[PDB]
């Protein structure tokens, strides 16, 4: 009796000067069966933070419910909504709480910090913690994170302008990388959810991907 199943999933997060994009494929399989087509993998923890959970779906759901409950408890205790950094630290503690029966779930929090700039944190199942600038996770992260390195970090491209990426360009980057992901990774595809976090709020945008 294996208590884990890999449900597949691809999530991506890009920070920025004033925005945070958190996107996820909507496909959700249980092996070689596409099974459900809906149920994206990005949750709106608060109007300034969205968390993308990938991997075992039962653990994704339970961890999301635990995070929401803990956000409510913090709100009642402190009379103020959690900041993105506080959510990241609390989630690190929660993930490490089950260090000897880990949540089989890769987490990427993305949202606005207190100063108002974008911020992306990436966690491993046991509860590691790092404030990256842009990170991919899940199954297609292997073929996604390199292109983000190329086009947001300008890696290996000498003699280039280091213009901060705009929201439109970041969205185009996300959509293109996820098109290539839907093509090359069988798990990825079947609709794409985008959550843009900015001072205005959280904008949800859906893009059709390869149905297979």
């Amino acid at each position: 009796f294996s208590p884990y199943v890999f449900n597949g999933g691809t999530i991506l997060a890009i920070a920025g000067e004033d925005f945070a994009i958190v996107a996820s494929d909507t496909r959700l399989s249980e092996g070689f069966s596409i099974h459900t087509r809906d149920s994206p993998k990005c949750y709106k923890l608060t109007d300034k933070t969205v968390i993308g959970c990938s991997g075992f779906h039962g653990d994704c759901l339970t961890l999301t419910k635990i995070i929401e409950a803990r956000l409510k408890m913090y709100k009642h205790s402190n009379n103020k909504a959690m900041t993105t950094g506080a959510i990241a630290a609390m989630l690190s503690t929660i993930l490490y709480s089950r260090r000897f029966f880990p949540y089989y779930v890769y987490n990427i929090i993305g949202g606005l910090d207190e100063e108002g700039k974008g911020a992306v944190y990436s966690f491993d199942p046991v509860g590691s913690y790092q404030r990256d600038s842009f990170k991919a996770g899940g199954s297609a992260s292997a073929m996604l994170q390199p292109l983000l390195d190329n086009q947001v970090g300008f890696k290996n491209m000498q003699n280039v302008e280091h213009v901060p990426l705009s929201l439109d360009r970041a969205m185009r980057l996300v959509k293109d990388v996820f098109i290539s992901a839907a093509e090359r990774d069988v798990y990825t595809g079947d609709a794409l959810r985008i959550c843009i976090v900015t001072k205005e709020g959280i904008r949800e945008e859906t893009v059709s991907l390869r149905k297979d």
């Binding site: 009796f1 208590p3 087509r37 809906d38 149920s39 039962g58 653990d59 759901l61 339970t62």
Partner: protein, 213 residues
């Protein structure tokens, strides 16, 4: 339940436009043996919720007992509040995940059908704790050979009426009995609509064997 002793088989659920219709064999298999055949693997949780399991029948019976007692307690309260199909789905998901984490799983895969507030609900609580709300569900070994038909029909016509939904579930159970070693030609169809839940007895398929001779 580390080892499933006497298991059911695939359970189907389709989102009728004004309700939900699920289908399930009456066969409780013990390995490669029919054993018990006159057992219903569908439960009427309440006026607007119904359940169908495709795993260890003992575990399904335990869950049926627990759910029935919960609904009885709620009715005893009788304060005008009723468990929604989604509420039953969430409670079932939490119970299954809790026992998974405890490493004492309930070896059941369950379709939850319901019709509340004019909204049809269909969920897929499995053994480990995976929970869904897909338009059509085919749990068990019937996923591979039943979900395709339902998906193609739904994509060609997203909204289904009573007659066509019933015909589609009949054809899917037909294919299941055709090519499922642990199936049986006696299946119940339970339909939940605004008027309540009705389980339509021991229906049978009119199998055509001259097709392949």
């Amino acid at each position: 339940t580390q080892n499933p002793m006497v298991t059911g088989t695939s359970v189907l659920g389709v989102k009728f436009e004004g309700g939900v219709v699920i289908a399930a064999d009456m066969l409780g298999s013990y390995g490669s043996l029919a054993r018990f055949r006159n057992i219903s693997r569908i439960m009427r949780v309440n006026n607007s919720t119904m359940l169908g399991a495709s795993g260890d029948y003992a575990d399904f019976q335990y869950l049926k007992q627990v759910l029935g007692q919960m609904v009885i307690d709620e009715e005893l309260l009788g304060d005008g509040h009723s468990y929604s199909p989604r509420a039953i789905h969430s409670w079932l998901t939490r119970a299954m995940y809790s026992r998974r984490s405890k490493m004492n799983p309930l070896w059941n895969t369950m379709v939850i059908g319901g019709y509340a507030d004019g909204e049809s609900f269909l969920g897929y609580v499995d053994m480990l704790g995976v929970a869904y709300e897909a338009p059509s569900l085919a749990t068990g070994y019937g996923a591979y050979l039943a979900q395709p038909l339902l998906r193609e029909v739904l994509e060609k016509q997203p909204v289904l009426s009573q007659t066509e939904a019933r015909d589609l579930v009949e054809r899917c159970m037909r294919v299941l009995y055709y090519r499922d070693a642990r199936s049986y030609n006696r299946f119940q169809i339970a339909t939940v609509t605004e008027k309540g839940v009705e389980i339509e007895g021991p229906l049978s398929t009119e199998t055509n064997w001259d097709i392949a001779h």
